Design a protein around this ligand. Structure first.
Ligand SMILES: NC(=O)C1=CN([C@@H]2O[C@H](COP(=O)(O)OP(=O)(O)OC[C@H]3O[C@@H](n4cnc5c(N)ncnc54)[C@H](O)[C@@H]3O)[C@@H](O)[C@H]2O)C=CC1
Ligand SMILES: NC(=O)C1=CN([C@@H]2O[C@H](COP(=O)(O)OP(=O)(O)OC[C@H]3O[C@@H](n4cnc5c(N)ncnc54)[C@H](O)[C@@H]3O)[C@@H](O)[C@H]2O)C=CC1
Lengths: 271, 271
């Protein structure tokens, strides 16, 4: 689908991959709504676009993607202020990793709430209007290559949710197609971002009784490696996927062999 | 690991696959705790084992796997009444399928609660004791080949949860191995069972506001095909998986080519 003249609603749009997607959709003629739980990220994103005299084409909404009431309100606000959206980017996510024995129910609930229920809530809150408006559209869900290649137990909560997002995206394709809405699942490798701030991003209700605060603290000190991919490169991959209705986008090839081995072991289990 | 003299806690143990697993574990020397939400299923299973002069080795507990308090109670009751368990079979599941545009948040919450949070609650409630007792053990999670081969939107909620269970099982392996607990994910094709009674099995709190009651009522009339596999055949596969610590068990090969095509499309997306 043509991006010019559309509105894109981008969760986690004010940092990292979502912000890279935002820049490149704007560059291709979309107007934007950036939805994010971090007011400071939103403010920074707004300033960045204002400096480039693009502030009129960008609206910001502070919300938690795991709060269904806020998501319903955001669908109304998006339509009223910016129109649409035609493009739905369910990209917000966090890193809930840590020693498996330390994780508590609060950590499971947090990890699944943001990384799996966020995209579901986006689909549920936004797609009825995308269908009704009858001008097609596109949905991008950000999963991870960690949802595909075998991962260790320290990453259980993350990998479990991200594998679900891949399958969610595959399964909804034919329903969305009824109304000329395409879908893409984005599976990144290492991208420069601020996901190391995940501890700050954890919603208040999941804080008490977490077993993983120490891990979040350590994570916050992790250096963004210079050889990780730039978010704008990912943004261009997403433009391409929307234009050409591509189901799968992977940013890196480094896990081809490990995925092949997993796939082989799965096939080998079949009579 | 070795099965004789162990205790196996089996969710959904009173019907279908779980009951097939129960029969074959008992045959191989295990004592059983069957946990199920259906009292009538539990009573029938009780009568079956009494008729075979094995009642003393089978205890039943009525519970909902998505109720964490009841699962904590079950871990206490299992240990106190029957010992252990040494073998944890997180097998309960339901069919939350239906026309995608009809599914509501209640349907998503239901399908994820039983088919994904059920196994997680089992792991969280039971594995601390399995580690503490220091005699190793095994965990079997029942996913589905629907979590691997591409599925249509009518099966979105089911597929999404089942894919997650596969990844969950893979990721916990190294943590469980620290305490000589092996893990297996079972991925069945069509097995003779009573899963068509899923509407009856939906917990009360997920009923109001469901969009799929009509689908559930049609499902209830579905005939169990004579050429579907017998649960005891699956049970024997699971005996072998526990004895030999096999990560993956698939019951059917009919989806080999459709999985291959999915896997190739995933690999093709990688640069
Ligand atoms: N190496 C990487 O950066 C990889 C990232 N991903 C995924 O990419 C997505 C984007 O993350 P990044 O750009 O890396 O990190 P990021 O932290 O720079 O950007 C994520 C944004 O989402 C926001 N956010 C977090 N939780 C939220 C919530 N509950 N509600 C609303 N907004 C929320 C954050 O405040 C942040 O601005 C995530 O889904 C992440 O899991 C996947 C693979 C690799
Ligand atoms: N029969 C088939 O063709 C396939 C079945 N499966 C899976 O096999 C597993 C077992 O299902 P089946 O043996 O086919 O059906 P079944 O309905 O005969 O057995 C499942 C049992 O789990 C119980 N149960 C349902 N919800 C529960 C809950 N919330 N708490 C406690 N118990 C609950 C049921 O009352 C029932 O006795 C499920 O996870 C299912 O998704 C996967 C692929 C194919």
């Amino acid at each position: 689908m043509d991006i010019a003249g559309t509105t894109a609603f981008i969760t986690g749009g004010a940092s990292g991959i979502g912000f890279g997607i935002a820049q490149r959709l704007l560059a291709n003629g979309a107007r934007l709504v950036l939805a994010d739980i971090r007011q400071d990220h939103l403010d920074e994103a707004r300033q960045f676009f204002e400096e480039r005299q693009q502030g009129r084409n960008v609206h910001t909404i502070r919300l938690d993607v795991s709060d269904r009431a806020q998501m319903a309100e955001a669908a109304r606000e998006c339509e009223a202020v910016m129109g649409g959206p035609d493009i739905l980017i369910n990209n917000a996510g966090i890193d809930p990793s840590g020693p498996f024995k330390d994780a508590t129910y609060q950590d499971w609930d947090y990890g699944l709430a943001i990384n799996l229920m966020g995209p579901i809530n986006g689909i549920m809150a936004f797609t009825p209007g995308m269908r009704a408006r009858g001008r097609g559209g596109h949905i991008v869900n950000t999963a991870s290559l960690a949802g595909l290649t075998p991962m260790p137990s320290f990453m259980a909560i993350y990998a479990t949710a991200k594998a679900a997002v891949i399958t969610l995206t595959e399964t909804i394709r034919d329903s969305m197609a009824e109304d000329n809405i395409g879908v893409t699942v984005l599976m990144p490798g290492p991208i420069k971002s601020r996901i190391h701030e995940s501890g700050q991003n954890r919603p208040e209700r999941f804080r008490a009784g977490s077993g993983l605060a120490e891990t979040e603290q350590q994570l916050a000190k992790r250096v963004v490696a210079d050889n990780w991919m730039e978010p704008t490169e990912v943004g261009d991959m997403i433009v391409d996927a929307i234009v050409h209705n591509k189901l799968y986008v992977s940013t890196h090839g480094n896990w081809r062999e490990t995925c092949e081995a997993r796939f082989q072991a799965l096939l080998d289990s079949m009579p």
